Design a protein around this ligand. Structure first.
Ligand code: COA
Ligand code: COA
Ligand code: COA
Ligand code: COA
Lengths: 394, 394, 394, 394
């Protein structure tokens, strides 16, 4: 049998807007900041880490091809610790946590860090013709940010797959704008009641008026009213459109990480843990319907966990698009009060490579706030996949 | 305990030169070719795959951020199969195989494909200032290929870290050029004797003279003598250099993959496999001496396998630079006659993300050629890492 | 002897700021607008124009290589009229007027249009490596705007030559900021008293609040006080600097044109002319001291005209930099009250390719306002030249 | 009246192919070479030049906006000499000579240099969105070479306007290919007989094999037969095409210049000159039929010279496309045996901005070869123009 994996500590940055407060912080900078902090929060020496795994999708500079290693080293981890970067698109952050946990499960390590880091503001343009030349004719500057949001098979924006999911599963424009408005309100509540304070690492943003601490998710609209959403126009299809800029998640910058140990190593260190890993699962779906990826992934994870949907006190199911999150809640039969209690992608943002690790942090801190037992963390994946993990508060 | 992992089939493309015969084949195109071919070789249906993992470092286009999923789908793997892309720099190809093997070891899958794909000819240039503009003053087009070959801490070419290793471990220029020459002669002999024919998937390269079959590693110099290497000048340092273009590996394009099954699925199907996985290990080292990463990784892997250096019949240790390949062989006490019996990176090329999977294929087919039992696959990793795996012919 | 050249009509746009009101109007768009207007103001059929010549330096798109022809055709000139684009850097606009006048002097035409057009906001970046490729290493995005402001011989900004002129000719920082402040005030006066109303062609700038007329030179600071200038720091040299962002001309967008006829053709058309051409002259100087180009050019033009500095009632001597305009006024012994009566480059802006034609328009309308006889129009030229023209009110 | 203009000396480079032997020589480098050489040929001191005018269309770098001044200064012309760059598209080279001649005709100078320089291999790509950014979505790298070959009104390649002229003037494919073949044979004969040796300035082209002399127009096919042109397909229209790569001119790199003096300065110095300028003329035509621009220009020039078609011993009418070159010869009634006796754009190449000056040199040296008296130099101009000049051997 495989060893048990304990999550001793976790942290996240505040989520920055596209072109906002974190646009000057590279992904390796953010990665290192969260690495150093989870080491501190867990009281673990950087010399005792067995593995580092980071999720990350859009390379913004050469260093990013070394992201996990740079975040680890500059985060204070000894140079003898291996470092891996993983890309499962929007699930990369949770995948990183899964991969790090596997090294503990398999006995290759008894300490491992799993996280993600992404700065979409710094997403580059590429010139595929620049190495060997165009010779003649106009060439293209390729938007790698928009390219990461396009299905590679039909070359359609991820939002077109959201419309496919809305049409197929019967999700109205009214229903989408409902989830969007509430998400903003739950998040505004969370920021007001301070539910995010402990999990967020503040970052001093060197402004010209003197430094200021960036410690609040800036995508949230605190004045949210339903007219703000009904006035918007569908962005991804010309006819019979329903997905808008308002009911679809933002594009954002952020990083997050968790530190994990084997059950034995955590016992022998007097660390007060957040939770323990119960199970995980992966699934693939039709790429044209990638939004409902979380449904089979969540169902397989419950099977491995020996649990039922009704045992889940906290559900972090990323709101990539209101169109698909409604169908996920509907097809699984979830209690919308237990799903994204404090908002998600629509309100908080979607720093794709980091989202999976970031919402794992949310789920665990929510479990402590409410004294719950089981949390589900799931999200959809461009190209047609889903990923899901279940944690137990302890 | 952990389930035994069987490698039933493997394949690689021939290795194309920089700007050479595969310059027109995208990484996802190459990846799909090898996926479809390992499936046919293992006699496994595209609908029966538990997981796909591909190593890949330098994104050449948006599709590449979906590389594993595009290679799997366009290789004929059903859409219900999860796909993951991993980046551990030059170790990514072998990491992909380890990651895929781990899903079998952990029971999440009984069939998994591990591979790697890289086209360095198609490595792009980025424009960091394109999205938000430069306003005034010259800007830069950033070479992402060279970027992937620069240590991200000191911002020095990997070749400089090769000089550090040569200096520290007493690897003379004469010794480096002797290894480089012997690598070309071994590869030229392997080509002439047809040792690679079975493991190579031909690719039809549309030429204006009509289609021709690309099936021979074109970086190899078949009439090389010692003077061809002595005449070259050091390329990476201005003073006291030893590393030349001739005793450094090439930059290349290729793909490779292997198909793995749980031992029980292999028994039941009645396959005639290549090998079983015995053990694997990772290691981190000083980034400035990344070339000796294989030493601690190989030692940790022999420990886990309960094996000794003398039990190894075949060794594929990638020749990133003769400077480090010599130090690796010297520090572990390996027989140079058993190390890379048919050449390696200096003569065949180094298609970064695919090399680890590619040389695994080479190792297993060489085991079959000599009736050997154990093979070691190991390689150094930029940023200061090593990776190693041991296979048993069965 | 050579025929006499009459200026029957002229016009200019308001001068736009770098990134300001005209950033969406290409140079051929502005060129055509001023072409059509001078035809109207002169009551000349587009079928009766013998030549069109336009000055223009920085190509912003392929069309600009056809600038004179596009401005003429889209401006309403018949397709049988030849069209020439000329580049004498900052003197291009006056050069265009000179070249057009020469066709009348030589009897090749008895109707000709001379003008200039420039949009520095739309100045492009180039990629010299893009046609045949960089192969490897970082390449450069070249700022063609900044490149046009750099001396091609020593590769120094035009402002460094201003410091050379200030040092050599004894122009203090106090003296420079004095001319700068007054220039802004004279211009603010001119805008207030409406002196520019008749010469300016308004351009409707399609805003989202409904269209608005852009008819006022927007570089001018109406609140100008000497502390605004003394607080600034020298921009072009680190030591012993004196040229600042405040005493140096702006970079701007604008177009202007004049319509000219032979004396006979103007007689036989009942056109009420602005002025007639008296003489012109060219000079070259040390490129490192290009600022004092106007001095020898003005002296040679007076010789050809048979006039003295004291016969000039209006002087338009472009204020490229306060450092050089002070030396020009000083070395020629000019009455600063007669020099730039309504401001110049520092206050109004410097749309380089159009400036020469634009300030000719100013000089002629000032001659009418004050009932004067002779006007001088001169300017310095990057690379080390000067150009000057003298007109007579009639 | 106007002063008589004497061409005392002329020179050209050999014409390099696109991406060929002159790809590494900037336009200002080529311009300076010919400037220094016409000075040496005329036996005139660099300090005795009244004006310099250079034709140039496609800026390859910032220096090119200073092209005439850089060519003059680096050609050894004293800095007191004014320098002007002119752009009349393919007519720029001849326009430069006319503009320079006009300063002599008008008395502003007794010595002037007229030339042209273009390196199309070095034509750049622009990035219109680089300065202020693209924010989101793909952008373009704009090919400025192709841009200079597109009519700016209908946005069609010049080759499409060649089809219009072929259609309208009944120029068959057979007739176009007959002209193209004969052009190569005439040029190949001229090379073999050494007719160009005296007029060509060799350029040492630094090769890895050692420096070699570039002194032969390398676009010429010396073993061409009718089948080489009949096999080619139309390149510019999808239906009913006639214009091919074989019967269209090349895109090329070269420079040329001539040195002119007033007749009195030539008398006094005792030079042995090439020719005197007799007359010149311009014309505009329908942009869609720009290929017949030379017809009205040549007619207007013969009128001014008081000459007839039959008085012309030599004719250099640039072969932009055989389609228009045939129509030009047909519409004026020229003897094809006198038109381009040694080839033209189809065989020798078409280095846009330099062609007009280059073929002037060719015309004057051919006059000396046959003891002819009068030469016509004419060419069509994109945008719908023509230019023509007549010279007398003396
Ligand atoms: C939906 C999408 C196309 C919108 O992008 P955008 O237009 O650039 O977003 P912006 O905030 O800059 O502008 C949207 C406009 O809608 C309006 N809007 C958006 N959300 C709103 C809200 N909650 N309330 C009121 N108005 C809103 C804004 O006023 C805004 O107007 P402005 O541009 O004048 O400021 C883009 O965010 C997207 O692609 N989302 C999906 C991302 C994705 O695929 N993630 C991975 C999937 S797993
Ligand atoms: C060393 C390096 C900078 C050379 O770049 P390159 O110029 O593109 O290399 P090429 O093989 O294409 O050609 C180099 C020149 O040396 C010569 N050359 C190459 N191999 C040779 C050999 N075995 N013998 C003699 N000459 C050789 C080539 O002929 C060529 O000369 P030429 O132009 O006259 O034909 C580059 O290959 C490199 O960086 N290698 C290291 C790869 C790496 O970092 N891998 C991962 C690190 S863990
Ligand atoms: C001088 C030069 C380097 C300054 O460029 P710039 O810094 O981009 O100009 P900007 O207006 O954007 O900024 C200048 C700053 O100085 C200050 N400044 C400039 N002029 C000022 C004035 N008249 N009053 C108060 N402040 C002023 C501004 O506040 C401004 O601050 P901000 O950036 O926060 O807004 C540039 O305009 C230049 O090159 N001028 C010469 C052009 C030339 O060579 N022409 C051809 C010669 S023949
Ligand atoms: C026509 C045009 C589009 C062709 O572009 P190109 O492909 O770069 O032309 P190239 O000469 O380099 O080669 C073209 C192909 O035709 C062939 N070719 C060229 N000339 C040939 C000839 N005389 N006979 C047979 N074949 C010929 C080349 O060999 C080559 O084939 P390959 O690749 O197998 O070697 C381009 O030359 C053009 O636009 N010309 C018009 C120029 C112009 O506009 N001047 C100003 C207008 S006023």
């Amino acid at each position: 049998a495989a060893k048990e994996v304990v999550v001793v500590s976790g942290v996240r940055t505040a989520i920055g807007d596209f072109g906002g407060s974190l646009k000057d912080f590279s992904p390796t900078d953010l990665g290192a900041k969260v690495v150093s902090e989870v080491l501190s929060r867990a009281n673990v020496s950087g010399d005792a880490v067995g593995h580092v795994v980071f999720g990350h999708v859009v390379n913004t500079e050469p260093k990013d091809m070394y992201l996990a290693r740079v975040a680890a080293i500059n985060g204070g981890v000894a140079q003898h610790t291996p470092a891996l970067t993983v890309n499962r698109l929007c699930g990369s952050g949770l995948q990183a946590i899964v991969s790090a946990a596997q090294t503990i499960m398999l006995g290759d390590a008894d300490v491992a860090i799993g996280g993600g880091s992404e700065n979409m503001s710094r997403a580059p343009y590429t010139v595929p013709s620049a190495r060997f030349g165009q010779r003649m004719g106009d060439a293209k500057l390729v938007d790698m940010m928009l390219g990461a949001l396009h299905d590679p098979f039909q070359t359609i924006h991820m939002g077109v797959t959201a419309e496919n999911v809305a049409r197929k599963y019967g999700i109205t424009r009214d229903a989408q704008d409902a989830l969007a408005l509430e998400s903003h309100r739950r998040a505004a509540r969370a920021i007001a009641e301070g539910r995010f304070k402990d999990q967020i690492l503040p970052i001093s943003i060197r402004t010209k008026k003197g430094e200021v601490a960036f410690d609040t998710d800036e995508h949230v609209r605190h004045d949210a009213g339903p007219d703000d959403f009904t006035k918007l126009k569908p962005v991804f299809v010309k006819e019979d459109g329903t997905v808008t800029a308002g009911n679809a998640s933002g594009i954002n910058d952020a990083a997050a990480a968790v530190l994990m140990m084997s059950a034995d190593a955590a016992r022998a260190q007097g660390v007060k843990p957040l939770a323990r890993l119960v199970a995980y699962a992966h699934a693939g779906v039709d790429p044209a319907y990638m939004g409902i990826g979380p449904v089979p992934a969540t169902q397989k994870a419950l099977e491995r966990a020996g649990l039922k949907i009704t045992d889940l006190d906290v559900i972090e199911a990323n709101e990539a698009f209101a169109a698909q999150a409604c169908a996920v809640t509907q097809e699984l039969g979830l209690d919308p009060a237990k799903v994204n209690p404090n908002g998600s992608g629509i309100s908080l943002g979607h720093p794709i490579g980091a989202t999976g690790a970031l919402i794992t942090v949310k789920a665990l801190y929510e479990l402590k706030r409410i004294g719950g037992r089981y949390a589900l963390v799931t999200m959809c994946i461009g190209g047609g996949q889903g990923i899901a993990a279940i944690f137990e508060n302890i």
